Write an enzyme that holds these catalytic residues in place. Sequence first.
Site, PDB file in Angstrom:
ATOM      1  N   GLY C 169       0.819  -1.212   0.000  1.00 42.05           N
ATOM      2  CA  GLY C 169       0.000   0.000   0.000  1.00 42.05           C
ATOM      3  C   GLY C 169       0.849   1.257   0.000  1.00 42.05           C
ATOM      4  O   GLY C 169       2.030   1.211   0.363  1.00 42.05           O
ATOM      5  N   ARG C 170       0.236   2.374  -0.395  1.00 44.13           N
ATOM      6  CA  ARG C 170       0.955   3.627  -0.641  1.00 44.13           C
ATOM      7  C   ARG C 170       0.003   4.824  -0.717  1.00 44.13           C
ATOM      8  O   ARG C 170      -1.103   4.702  -1.223  1.00 44.13           O
ATOM      9  CB  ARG C 170       1.760   3.515  -1.946  1.00 44.13           C
ATOM     10  CG  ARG C 170       2.570   4.752  -2.347  1.00 44.13           C
ATOM     11  CD  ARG C 170       2.800   4.809  -3.860  1.00 44.13           C
ATOM     12  NE  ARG C 170       3.496   3.616  -4.334  1.00 44.13           N
ATOM     13  CZ  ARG C 170       4.808   3.412  -4.227  1.00 44.13           C
ATOM     14  NH1 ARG C 170       5.601   4.318  -3.658  1.00 44.13           N
ATOM     15  NH2 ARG C 170       5.341   2.291  -4.698  1.00 44.13           N
ATOM     16  N   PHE C 173       2.155  10.283   1.695  1.00 42.89           N
ATOM     17  CA  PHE C 173       3.286  10.443   2.583  1.00 42.89           C
ATOM     18  C   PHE C 173       4.180   9.243   2.721  1.00 42.89           C
ATOM     19  O   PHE C 173       5.223   9.348   3.344  1.00 42.89           O
ATOM     20  CB  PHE C 173       2.803  10.817   3.959  1.00 42.89           C
ATOM     21  CG  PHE C 173       2.024  12.091   4.011  1.00 42.89           C
ATOM     22  CD1 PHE C 173       2.217  13.093   3.083  1.00 42.89           C
ATOM     23  CD2 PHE C 173       1.133  12.310   5.043  1.00 42.89           C
ATOM     24  CE1 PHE C 173       1.512  14.276   3.166  1.00 42.89           C
ATOM     25  CE2 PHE C 173       0.433  13.497   5.136  1.00 42.89           C
ATOM     26  CZ  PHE C 173       0.615  14.480   4.189  1.00 42.89           C
ATOM     27  N   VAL C 176       3.152   1.201   2.920  1.00 49.11           N
ATOM     28  CA  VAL C 176       2.967   0.152   3.889  1.00 49.11           C
ATOM     29  C   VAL C 176       3.585  -1.120   3.360  1.00 49.11           C
ATOM     30  O   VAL C 176       3.379  -1.498   2.210  1.00 49.11           O
ATOM     31  CB  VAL C 176       1.495  -0.102   4.200  1.00 49.11           C
ATOM     32  CG1 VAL C 176       1.372  -1.224   5.213  1.00 49.11           C
ATOM     33  CG2 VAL C 176       0.851   1.153   4.747  1.00 49.11           C
ATOM     34  N   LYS C 191       3.402   0.647   8.336  1.00 48.75           N
ATOM     35  CA  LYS C 191       3.306   1.923   7.641  1.00 48.75           C
ATOM     36  C   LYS C 191       4.600   2.733   7.838  1.00 48.75           C
ATOM     37  O   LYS C 191       5.170   2.705   8.912  1.00 48.75           O
ATOM     38  CB  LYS C 191       2.121   2.685   8.209  1.00 48.75           C
ATOM     39  CG  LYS C 191       1.628   3.853   7.377  1.00 48.75           C
ATOM     40  CD  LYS C 191       0.128   4.073   7.579  1.00 48.75           C
ATOM     41  CE  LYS C 191      -0.294   5.512   7.294  1.00 48.75           C
ATOM     42  NZ  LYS C 191      -1.775   5.582   7.175  1.00 48.75           N
ATOM     43  N   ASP C 288     -13.859  10.114   6.481  1.00 50.96           N
ATOM     44  CA  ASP C 288     -13.386   9.844   5.127  1.00 50.96           C
ATOM     45  C   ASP C 288     -13.759   8.444   4.671  1.00 50.96           C
ATOM     46  O   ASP C 288     -12.982   7.800   3.968  1.00 50.96           O
ATOM     47  CB  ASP C 288     -11.863  10.044   5.076  1.00 50.96           C
ATOM     48  CG  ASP C 288     -11.314  10.130   3.656  1.00 50.96           C
ATOM     49  OD1 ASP C 288     -11.990  10.662   2.738  1.00 50.96           O
ATOM     50  OD2 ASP C 288     -10.169   9.664   3.491  1.00 50.96           O
TER      51      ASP C 288
HETATM   52  C1  LIG Z   1      -1.081   9.312   6.691  1.00 52.51           C
HETATM   53  O1  LIG Z   1      -1.409  10.699   6.607  1.00 52.51           O
HETATM   54  C2  LIG Z   1      -2.620  11.105   6.092  1.00 52.51           C
HETATM   55  C3  LIG Z   1      -3.531  11.719   6.948  1.00 52.51           C
HETATM   56  C4  LIG Z   1      -4.782  12.130   6.480  1.00 52.51           C
HETATM   57  C5  LIG Z   1      -5.106  11.945   5.136  1.00 52.51           C
HETATM   58  C6  LIG Z   1      -4.190  11.340   4.275  1.00 52.51           C
HETATM   59  O2  LIG Z   1      -4.552  11.178   2.949  1.00 52.51           O
HETATM   60  C7  LIG Z   1      -4.090  12.098   1.932  1.00 52.51           C
HETATM   61  C8  LIG Z   1      -2.953  10.915   4.756  1.00 52.51           C
HETATM   62  C9  LIG Z   1      -1.952  10.271   3.837  1.00 52.51           C
HETATM   63  N1  LIG Z   1      -2.004   8.829   3.845  1.00 52.51           N
HETATM   64  C10 LIG Z   1      -1.014   8.173   3.272  1.00 52.51           C
HETATM   65  O3  LIG Z   1      -0.061   8.807   2.851  1.00 52.51           O
HETATM   66  C11 LIG Z   1      -1.001   6.699   2.992  1.00 52.51           C
HETATM   67  C12 LIG Z   1      -2.084   6.048   2.411  1.00 52.51           C
HETATM   68  C13 LIG Z   1      -2.036   4.677   2.111  1.00 52.51           C
HETATM   69  C14 LIG Z   1      -3.183   3.958   1.463  1.00 52.51           C
HETATM   70  N2  LIG Z   1      -4.098   4.958   0.857  1.00 52.51           N
HETATM   71  C15 LIG Z   1      -5.363   5.139   1.280  1.00 52.51           C
HETATM   72  O4  LIG Z   1      -6.075   6.043   0.778  1.00 52.51           O
HETATM   73  N3  LIG Z   1      -5.912   4.366   2.228  1.00 52.51           N
HETATM   74  C16 LIG Z   1      -5.298   3.277   2.721  1.00 52.51           C
HETATM   75  C17 LIG Z   1      -6.080   2.325   3.588  1.00 52.51           C
HETATM   76  C18 LIG Z   1      -3.898   3.014   2.365  1.00 52.51           C
HETATM   77  C19 LIG Z   1      -3.288   1.771   2.888  1.00 52.51           C
HETATM   78  O5  LIG Z   1      -3.078   0.964   2.023  1.00 52.51           O
HETATM   79  N4  LIG Z   1      -3.103   1.632   4.218  1.00 52.51           N
HETATM   80  C20 LIG Z   1      -2.911   0.486   4.949  1.00 52.51           C
HETATM   81  C21 LIG Z   1      -3.013   0.571   6.341  1.00 52.51           C
HETATM   82  C22 LIG Z   1      -2.849  -0.552   7.163  1.00 52.51           C
HETATM   83  C23 LIG Z   1      -2.588  -1.787   6.583  1.00 52.51           C
HETATM   84  N5  LIG Z   1      -2.408  -3.056   7.005  1.00 52.51           N
HETATM   85  N6  LIG Z   1      -2.187  -4.000   5.986  1.00 52.51           N
HETATM   86  C24 LIG Z   1      -2.252  -3.252   4.884  1.00 52.51           C
HETATM   87  C25 LIG Z   1      -2.498  -1.889   5.237  1.00 52.51           C
HETATM   88  C26 LIG Z   1      -2.657  -0.773   4.420  1.00 52.51           C
HETATM   89  C27 LIG Z   1      -0.868   3.974   2.371  1.00 52.51           C
HETATM   90  C28 LIG Z   1       0.213   4.627   2.942  1.00 52.51           C
HETATM   91  C29 LIG Z   1       0.150   5.989   3.245  1.00 52.51           C
HETATM   92  F1  LIG Z   1       1.213   6.612   3.808  1.00 52.51           F
END
Ligand SMILES: COc1cccc(OC)c1CNC(=O)c1cc([C@@H]2NC(=O)NC(C)=C2C(=O)Nc2ccc3[nH]ncc3c2)ccc1F
Lengths: 58, 339, 628
Positions: C169-170, C173, C176, C191, C288
């Site tokens: 995942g990605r 920022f 994962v 993460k 969200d």
């Molecule tokens: C983390 O900071 C915030 C805070 C608020 C909003 C926001 O979105 C722009 C963000 C940015 N989020 C991310 O950058 C981020 C987002 C994701 C993926 N994108 C997404 O939209 N949603 C999800 C669920 C993501 C994701 O895949 N997350 C995730 C979490 C726990 C896990 N366990 N096993 C797999 C797994 C995966 C993965 C890594 C990341 F660093």
Amino acid sequence: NTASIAQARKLVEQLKMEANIDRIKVSKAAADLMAYCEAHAKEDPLLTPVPASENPFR
Amino acid sequence: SELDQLRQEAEQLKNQIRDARKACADATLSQITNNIDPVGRIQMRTRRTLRGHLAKIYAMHWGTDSRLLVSASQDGKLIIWDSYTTNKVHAIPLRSSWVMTCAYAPSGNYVACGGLDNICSIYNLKTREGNVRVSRELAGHTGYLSCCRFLDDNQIVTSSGDTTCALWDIETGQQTTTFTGHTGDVMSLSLAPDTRLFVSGACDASAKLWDVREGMCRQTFTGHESDINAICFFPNGNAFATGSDDATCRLFDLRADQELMTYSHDNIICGITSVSFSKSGRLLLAGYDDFNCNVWDALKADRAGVLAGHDNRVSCLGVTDDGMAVATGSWDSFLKIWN
Amino acid sequence: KKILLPEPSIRSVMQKYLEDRGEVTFEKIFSQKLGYLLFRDFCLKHLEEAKPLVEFYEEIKKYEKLETEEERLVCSREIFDTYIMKELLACSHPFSKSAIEHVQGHLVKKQVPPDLFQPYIEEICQNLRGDVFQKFIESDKFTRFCQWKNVELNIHLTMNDFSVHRIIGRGGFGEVYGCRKADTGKMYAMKCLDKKRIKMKQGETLALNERIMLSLVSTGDCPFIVCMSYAFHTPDKLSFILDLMNGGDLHYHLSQHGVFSEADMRFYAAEIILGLEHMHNRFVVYRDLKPANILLDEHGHVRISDLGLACDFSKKKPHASVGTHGYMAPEVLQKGVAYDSSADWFSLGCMLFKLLRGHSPFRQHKTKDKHEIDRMTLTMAVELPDSFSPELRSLLEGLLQRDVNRRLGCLGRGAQEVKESPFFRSLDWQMVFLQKYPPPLIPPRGSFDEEDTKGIKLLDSDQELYRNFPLTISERWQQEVAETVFDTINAETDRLEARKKTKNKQLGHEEDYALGKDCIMHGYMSKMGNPFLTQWQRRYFYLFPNRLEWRGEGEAPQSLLTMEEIQSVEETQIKERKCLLLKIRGGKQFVLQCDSDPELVQWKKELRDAYREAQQLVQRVPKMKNKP
Ligand SMILES: COc1cccc(OC)c1CNC(=O)c1cc([C@@H]2NC(=O)NC(C)=C2C(=O)Nc2ccc3[nH]ncc3c2)ccc1F
């Protein structure tokens, strides 16, 4: 404590016992001390050092 | 007012005592001993060095065999040394760390010690099984134990910071007599040779003569300008010597009821922690807070010797019953035997 | 690189560390997983009075978990006959008349709900709280507690504590990865957020927030949220250790499979509701909610993940517009206008809509027009295809009703209202919770990367915002440990100890140095020795009220400090290692390094305490004080 009537009375009765003892002249007291010292100086290792022979710490 | 009446009556009684004493002052000890020969100088040199305590030493006592001695330390232990060999015979972990005094009993069967725990603890040296236990805990004082001396194996006398001294019955742990009258912490006590009287030195700058058996104070000596820290009988029970924060030792005669001598010099400013007479009485040894022990001539007042091999305070000292030796113990963790 | 318990000496420091903090109570220890584990090993095995009670506690606990009514009649009979009736027959029932009369009356009325024996639970507790609890604290089992706690309270993690695997995942920022914590074997997601990439887009609050939100919802062991077990960082990266879901997200699978039937959507909505309940119960709104934040695990069950944009309403409640576009409720989008639980319920609607009919109900005809989707959601409900059954229809109009006070969930009973919809008439909600329903989609088995964009600086003023990011969730760690290495580490450590006791009834040294005196606290620390060299030597220390003694193995102590000598006690850094700095009267210095943060905390505390008391005491004892 010093407000105590019993304490003031205890104190007075004490100074009484201390005021009414027999005293001797100092001239006298001084002689008996001097006397003792002479009577026992030949018995006193620090006064006249005895040789290695008898002294346990050599 | 009757409270006012008793305050004057005590004031006039002190005057009566002051005048009664001056009336005996027909001559001085220093006059009376003017033509007897000096002592020379006392060649005294470290023989043994008792190595073991891991911190400051506060107190020591010679056993009557003139061979063993107990010592008490900041490190929380008593150590019973054989001074001939420097071999530790026993090392004793105390239950309180705040020990401050100790005493070898005359039979050699028991020691006592105590301190900020407000308790005099009797340790037994050879039990049936043959090892060292607490046989009693003499409790009753409401302030630190400052000093303690056995009369025999069943009675002991203690002094305290609660301003009292006391007599105990060891078998039952009872406080049988209580000696009140001091108005400051009692620091030191000395037994007469007959054990029927003893003297105390206190932070009120007064020393006092007591009768053991009748429980009262017979005499009060004064003149020191500061805490009396140490006290010792002249070997014939008729006078005693005291040491004080005022940098002087003094000699007080019992039967003349007053001071006979001051031992002091302008270039000695530190206080005295400990005093002992040599066997014959001629030498008055004093332990000082400048790291030395001084030998005075009791009869003449001249300073006659120095014992100098400690890098901290000489807290305590002692002469043996056989006159052969002097222990000095120090804040530097060491005892030394001199002659 | 497996867990290593400290020796039992550790009890001296830990029992005081906890006692200062108020933690040696039945309530606090019994409610810890490893705490309960140890206290019951003690009662059952090492005390014949308590064994009955705990065996009784456990039978009742097992009883709560029984699924069927058939099963509870059978069991309630067993328990009553064994722990109640028989005990009365032999006059050894230490319980209420009230408690017996509760059960008695229910049973003859053949009534058997899971909370049947609840009133014994309180009373078994009261019967253990007292003497048994104090005797437990006496035991070697509380020693073992202190040993395990020393480890808990001494966790510091680094990428090296993990064996990192492939990307799952990605986002903005960072990434994962899946991973394995070497310690225990346990599998996790990691993460990893790039601090530079954060600073740039200027969302430190957002990273910080996710951590704080995770920390509010991560206790409880909820099967429908992706929770946090730990969090740590490096100069460069933030790290979250989260639940591992390696079946992807709904966005992907939806595009893979197409739109979902109602019966298949019924499954996703149940599980999602239960997670919403949980968060809402902990006074947290997600904001969200969308298919892409629903991750599927390896069998098909789902979870809500990624609490970045979530928010707490335990006091102030949010007004601002946050989330994706056809899932934001009205009250959301009105700035100034406050809101809470409300919006999730709405989103759920749009989300569930989107799983059936392929796009948000407010995203008309492939439009990519924000302010259009905004304004239609503001003042128009939607013709829901004729094909939706009345019940789904009812549900969606219940959920999407624009007025917050005529909307399902937000009528004062929450998730409960939604569970009562006709749409979920066929569902048993304990079987949903227990994950017993078959998921529609089973994820099938196994160049998105980041170009180095910016030459940006990471200052001391940056790394201060993440001062409070690192953390461990105790319940997680204990649970992790309970089910992996707890038993084998416990018996290994039992052998290690029982052997060393045997070797000391040989090698001489037994009669224990601390005992019998006025020793305050003992334990290992290290000091420098060699002044000109400065390497650390480990010794066993003993704190007495007027001195600090130490000794090497074999011989009793031959060195010390006095409390008198010590002037000050402060923290200092040596080899990026927190140590204690003792200043001594001569102008000298003494340095101490302890083996775990609790030990540093306690040694600093008790040393300070000891020397202040020693000095205030000694200056009222003429024979002890310094003279002028
Ligand atoms: C983390 O900071 C915030 C805070 C608020 C909003 C926001 O979105 C722009 C963000 C940015 N989020 C991310 O950058 C981020 C987002 C994701 C993926 N994108 C997404 O939209 N949603 C999800 C669920 C993501 C994701 O895949 N997350 C995730 C979490 C726990 C896990 N366990 N096993 C797999 C797994 C995966 C993965 C890594 C990341 F660093």
